[PDB]
Paper text:
Here we determined the cryo-electron microscopy structure of the Mycobacterium smegmatis hydrogenase Huc and investigated its mechanism. Huc is a highly efficient oxygen-insensitive enzyme that couples oxidation of atmospheric H2 to the hydrogenation of the respiratory electron carrier menaquinone. Huc uses narrow hydrophobic gas channels to selectively bind atmospheric H2 at the expense of O2, and 3 [3Fe–4S] clusters modulate the properties of the enzyme so that atmospheric H2 oxidation is energetically feasible. The Huc catalytic subunits form an octameric 833 kDa complex around a membrane-associated stalk, which transports and reduces menaquinone 94 Å from the membrane.
To determine the structure of Huc, we performed cryo-electron microscopy (cryo-EM) imaging and single-particle reconstruction of the purified 833 kDa complex. Three-dimensional reconstruction of the Huc complex yielded maps at a 2.19 Å overall resolution, showing that each of the four lobes of Huc are composed of two Huc protomers, each consisting of a HucS and HucL subunit. The four Huc lobes are bound to a scaffold formed by four molecules of HucM, an elongated α-helical protein that intertwines to form a cage-like structure. Out of the 188 amino acids of HucM, only residues 20–79 could be modelled into the cryo-EM density maps, with diffuse density corresponding to the remaining C-terminal region of HucM forming the stalk-like protrusion. Analysis of the Huc EM maps reveals additional density near the distal [3Fe–4S] cluster of each Huc protomer, which could be unambiguously modelled as menaquinone. Consistent with this, mass spectrometry confirmed that β-dihydromenaquinone-9 associates with purified Huc with an occupancy of 96.2%. The interior surface of the internal cavity of Huc is lined by hydrophobic sidechains of HucS and HucM, which facilitate the binding of menaquinone and other hydrophobic molecules and has dimensions capable of accommodating menaquinone. Activity staining of cell lysates shows that although Huc is active in this mutant, the high molecular weight species was not present, suggesting that HucM is critical for the formation of the Huc oligomer.
Numbering used by the authors:
A (entry chain D), B (entry chain B): 2 to 323
C (entry chain A): 4 to 516
D (entry chain Q): 20 to 78
Write the structure that this text describes.
Amino acid sequence: ASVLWFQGGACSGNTMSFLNADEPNVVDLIVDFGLDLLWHPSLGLELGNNAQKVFWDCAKGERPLDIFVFEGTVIEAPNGTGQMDMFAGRPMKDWVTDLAGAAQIVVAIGDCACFGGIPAMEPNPSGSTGLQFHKREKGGFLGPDFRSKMGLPVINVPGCPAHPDWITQILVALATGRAGDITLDDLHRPETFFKTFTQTGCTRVQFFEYKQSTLSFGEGTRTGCLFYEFGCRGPMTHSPCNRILWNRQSSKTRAGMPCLGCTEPEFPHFDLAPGTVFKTQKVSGMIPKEVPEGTDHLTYMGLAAAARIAAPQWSKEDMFVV
Amino acid sequence: ASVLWFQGGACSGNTMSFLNADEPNVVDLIVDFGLDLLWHPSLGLELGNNAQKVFWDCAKGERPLDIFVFEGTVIEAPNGTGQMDMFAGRPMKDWVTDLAGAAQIVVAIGDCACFGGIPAMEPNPSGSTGLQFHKREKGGFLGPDFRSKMGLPVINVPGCPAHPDWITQILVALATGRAGDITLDDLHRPETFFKTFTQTGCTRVQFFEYKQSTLSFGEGTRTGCLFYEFGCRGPMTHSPCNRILWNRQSSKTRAGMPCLGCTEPEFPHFDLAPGTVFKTQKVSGMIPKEVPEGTDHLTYMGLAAAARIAAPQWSKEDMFVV
Amino acid sequence: LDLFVSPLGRVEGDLDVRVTINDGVVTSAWTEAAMFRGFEIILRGKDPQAGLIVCPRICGICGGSHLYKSAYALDTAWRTHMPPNATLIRNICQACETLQSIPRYFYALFAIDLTNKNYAKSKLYDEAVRRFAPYVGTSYQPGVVLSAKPVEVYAIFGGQWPXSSFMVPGGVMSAPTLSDVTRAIAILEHWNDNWLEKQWLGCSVDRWLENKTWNDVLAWVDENESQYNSDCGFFIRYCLDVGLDKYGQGVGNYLATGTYFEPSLYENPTIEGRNAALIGRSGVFADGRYFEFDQANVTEDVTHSFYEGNRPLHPFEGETIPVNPEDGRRQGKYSWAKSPRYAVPGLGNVPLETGPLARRMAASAPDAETHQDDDPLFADIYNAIGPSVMVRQLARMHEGPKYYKWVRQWLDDLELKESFYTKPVEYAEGKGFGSTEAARGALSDWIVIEDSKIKNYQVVTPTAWNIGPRDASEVLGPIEQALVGSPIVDAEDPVELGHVARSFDSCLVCTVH
Amino acid sequence: SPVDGIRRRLDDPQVAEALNSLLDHADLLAVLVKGLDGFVRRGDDIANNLTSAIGELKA
Ligand code: FCO
Ligand code: F3S
Ligand code: F3S
Ligand code: F3S
Ligand code: F3S
Ligand code: F3S
Ligand code: F3S
Ligand SMILES: [Mg+2]
Ligand code: 3NI
C-alpha cells in the first residue's frame, strides 16, 4: 500500500506525533506492515526533481497511490492562487487536487488538514482550509462530495496534533484487511477513536461528577476537574486522549492542562479570543456557557448542585499527590 | 542497594507483573539503578547451599540487606509451625522473621504478602497472613509495631498482583534518593499510587456519573459502568489502575471487567461467597449495599436518581465501539 | 551420595530435590513440592465463578491458562454458548501468555544455567556467558524484556496481565475495538520480529516451521550464519556440545490435554466434544503409541503426597485434605504435589510427562483434522534422539513460531461486529471439565457445582503431572525419572538437576496450588 | 443481664400496651415498607418516567 504524505500549512506536529508511534512504531509501520511510504517531506530521501518525479507519477496515475496523507492546511492565499504554499513547483493546493483525485484513500491528519485548524483562525492570512471541512462546515478544499477511489470521503484524523495511534492504527487496519472495520463519524473521524470524549478516562471525572473544580495550576491540579475554571473542553470533545494516552504516559487533562477541544473542528475554539484561554466562560459567574455534550444547562446545573451537596470529602482534597 | 526477594504463599504473579516492568524495565532496574538483586526464587542463579549461604548471610547480618521484598503469604500452618511453606531448610515464616529483622526496608508486594490475600480466604488452610496485616487488621505476621531498620513499617504494595510500577517506581525512588518522597497511607501503601481510586481514570466514570449500567459482558461492555450490575469496586478501591494502565494498555474496568478491589486488604471481598462474584449486592434490588467511598446511601441514591434523570443520550449508548 | 538440594529455584515456587548419586549419576530422585496454599480447599462453598478469580492466582506466569480452563470448566458445567469471537479471544490470550512464558522462562529461568562453570571447557562457553548470563546476558536482556509484549496483547483483551478474570462462562467480559485488534497485531508482529525471528530464530517463523525432522533442524542450524548464531541455533549447538541431549529423558510418555478450540467446533462447550474441537490437539503418547486423551482416565494419587487418601481419585471425586508434613514424612510422603496418573490400557495408571514436548508428540498423531496442529517434527525427533533436556526445550521453543502464527491468524479471524459473550444460565448444579495447555502442559479443572456453590474444585496442573511424587506403585513421576540418569559433575552446584527440572519449565506454585 | 432488662421493660404495662398497639398496626407498617420496597424496585422506572416528562417539557 503506497503512501504519499504531503504537508501544506503544517507545523509537522502530526508527523512528529506519528513518529512517536508505538505498537506499531513508525519504522515497523513503514517497513513491516506493507505500507510503502513513497515520500514524506520530513522523511523522504528524494529531493528536487527525483521527489517531483515521485509526486507527478502519483498525480498522473503512472504509479498507484493507495493512501494520500495530507497534513497542514490547504493554503489558498493569495487570491485563491495558493502561492503562500508553493511545493515542488506548484501551489500545494494543486498537488492536493491531483493527489486526492488519484489516491485510493485520502487521510487528513491533524486539524489543519481536517478542518483548517490554527492557520484558519481569523484573519486566516494564508486562506487556509481543510481538505473536506472548513471548521465544522463540510466541504473544505475538496468539496463536500469528494470521494477517494475506494469511495471514502477524506478520513479526518483530527487533533493538533493527532495522536500517533489515531493514524497508525487506521493504517494497520488498512494494512491488515480491516478497512471495513473503520467507521467514520459525521466529521469523517474514525469512530474507534472519536466516539469517546477526552473526558472518557480522564483522571478528574470523579471531581467533575462531584463538581469539584481545580482552582489553580501547578499543585492546584493535584485535585479537581479543569472544566469549571480552566475551560476544559473534555466533556464536549470527542477523542480517546484519556483512553489511549499521549506518549503512552498522560494526557493534557491528566497533567492538569485543560483539553482545548483540538479534535473538534472549531479548534481553536472561540479563536482564542481574549478571556477564552484556560478559562471557563460563565453566565452570571456560575453557569458555564457550554455544558457537556448532550446535556442542557438546567439539568446540568441541577445535577451539579445535587453533586456539590452530596460531594464526598476525598473529592475535595488532593488526589494526585506526590 | 541489595534486594532479597522471597516468596511465601505466592503464585509469583507479583514477580511476573514486576517482570512486565517498563520505564524502568526489570533488567534496567536490576542492573542500571544500583539495586543488587541478591536472590529471587524466580530469577536467582544460586540454588541449594549457595542460595542458602546468601540467605543466611542476609539473615545474620554478614552482608547488608537493604530491601527485603516478600511476595506471597506468610504461611503459618500447620499449628503455627509454618511447615506448609518450607524454604531452604526452614519454615518460610522463620526466614521472614530473620530477614525482615535484617532489612533496611521491608516491602510486601501483592495482597498475599500485604494482607494475606487469596490464601487467607476462609478456611485459610495454610494459616496464611500478611507481613504486617491480616486483611484490614494491622499486625499480620510481624506485628503492628514492626519497623525496618530505616524506621519504616512494611511498605505494602498491594494488588493481586501488584502492577510493576507500584514496586518499580518505589524502587527507583529509593535508588534515586527520593525515599523521603514516599508517603504511606494507613495501610502502608504508597500514596503516590493509592490516593486515587481504580475509578480514577476509568473510561466508564461518565457512565457512572449518569448511573448508566453495563448490562452484560462482551459487547455489553461497549457502554456503561460496571458498578451497578457487576460489582465493580472501582469507587471503593484505592489504586492507580486507570491512571497507570496495566501492561501499558488497559485496566480491568476499561476492558469491561469489574474491579475486584484487589488493592484493598479485604480482597477477595466477601471471600467470593456465592452471589458476590461479578455481581453488585443490592438492597431491595436497586440500592447497592456498598456505595462509593465517602458517600452515604441517602445522598448517593438521591444524586443517582438526579443523574439518571439528567443523563445525556450518549451515556445510554455504546461508546467503546469497534 | 544422598544430595538434598534446597532450594532449587527458578521453578516458580518452592522445590527441593533429593537425589541418590552413584558414580556421578543420579540413580533415584524425589521431587519435594514444599509450599501449600490449598486453593481447592478455599474454593469449596464459594461462588461457582470464584474459580475465575482464584485459579489465576494459582500462578503468576500461567494464571491466564488457569483462567482459560476455569472458564471452560464453567462453560461445560453450565452448558454455555461460546461465540466464536470469545473462543478466538480466549485462544489468543492463552497463546499470548504462552508466548510470554517461552522467552521469559527460557532466558530468566533456564538458560542462565548454561553459564554454569561445569561448561567452562566448552568452546561455546564464552558465548553462552555473553548471551545468557543473568541480567546482563546479551540474549537474556532483550529476551526477558520483550517477553512482556505478548501479555500486553493479553492485557488489551483482558484488562491486565497477570490477574485478569475476563474469561467467563458464555465468552469474555471484554469487547475488543478495532484499535485493540490492530494494536494487538502490531505488538505481536513487533515481538515476533524483534525477539522470535531476529533473536531466537535468526530466520522467519515460516522457515523454522519448515523443519519436519531432526535432520531438518540440524540443517537449519548449519544453513546460514543467522540461524547458526541465533539463540535457537546457538542453544542447539550448545546442547549438543555440553551434553544436554544426553540426559533428562524422563518417562518418554506424554499427556497433552490440548487447547485452542476451533471457534465453530466449540460454540457449545461439552466434555465429550472437547477433543475434536481442539486446534492444539490433545493426545496421550504412551509406549510409543498414540491414545485419545480422556479426562475420565485421570487419577490423583496422594500416597507420597502430604494429603490424606488411600486410593487414586478421579478429580471429580478429588479431595485435598492436607496432612502435617512431619506426620506425612513419617509415612513416606515427601511432597505437596499430588501424583497425577493416567490410565493407559495395557499399562495401568502411568505417569505422563506434560508440556510442550507432550503437545508436539500429540501434534504428531495421525488423523489430524484440518483445524488441528499436524506436525511430525517431534515424532521424528523422539524417534531419532529421544527425549532429553535439549529436546524438551526445543519443543517449548518450537511452540513459539507455531503459536505466533496461530495468534496472528486468530486476530485476523476476529469479527469485531459479532458477539463476544452469550449470557449463560448460572445453573445451581453442574459438572464442568475445563482443560488447556498452559505453557508447561496439561492444565485441567474438574468442578462440581451444587446448590449454586462450588461443591468440588480439583485442579491438576502440568507440573503436578511432571513433578508429582511416586504413586502407590512407587513409580517415579516424570521429572523424578528424568532426574534419574542425570550426571552430577559438582554436588555443590548440581546444575544438572536444575537443567532437568527447569527443562520441564516446572512451576511449583501450580504444582501444589 | 441487659437482655433481661429489655424483657423486664416488656413486662411494663405501658410498654406492653404500646408494643401491642404497634403489633395491631403492624399490617400498615408492613404495607408501607412493602410500598417502599416496591417504589425502590421500580425506582428506575420512575426515573425513566421523570426523564420522559422532563424530555417533553424540553421539546
Ligand atoms: N504453564 C503452567 Fe502452570 C504449571 N504447571 C499451569 O497450568
Ligand atoms: S500539530 Fe501542526 S500540522 Fe496543524 S493540526 Fe496542529 S498546527
Ligand atoms: S473530568 Fe477531565 S476531561 Fe476536563 S472536564 Fe474535567 S479535567
Ligand atoms: S486538546 Fe486535543 S489532544 Fe486530546 S486532550 Fe483535548 S482532544
Ligand atoms: S498475584 Fe499471587 S502472590 Fe498473592 S498477591 Fe495475588 S495471589
Ligand atoms: S466508573 Fe469504572 S472503576 Fe468501576 S464503578 Fe464504573 S467501571
Ligand atoms: S481488582 Fe486490582 S488491579 Fe486494579 S482494577 Fe481493581 S484494584
Ligand atoms: Mg490439584
Ligand atoms: Ni505456573
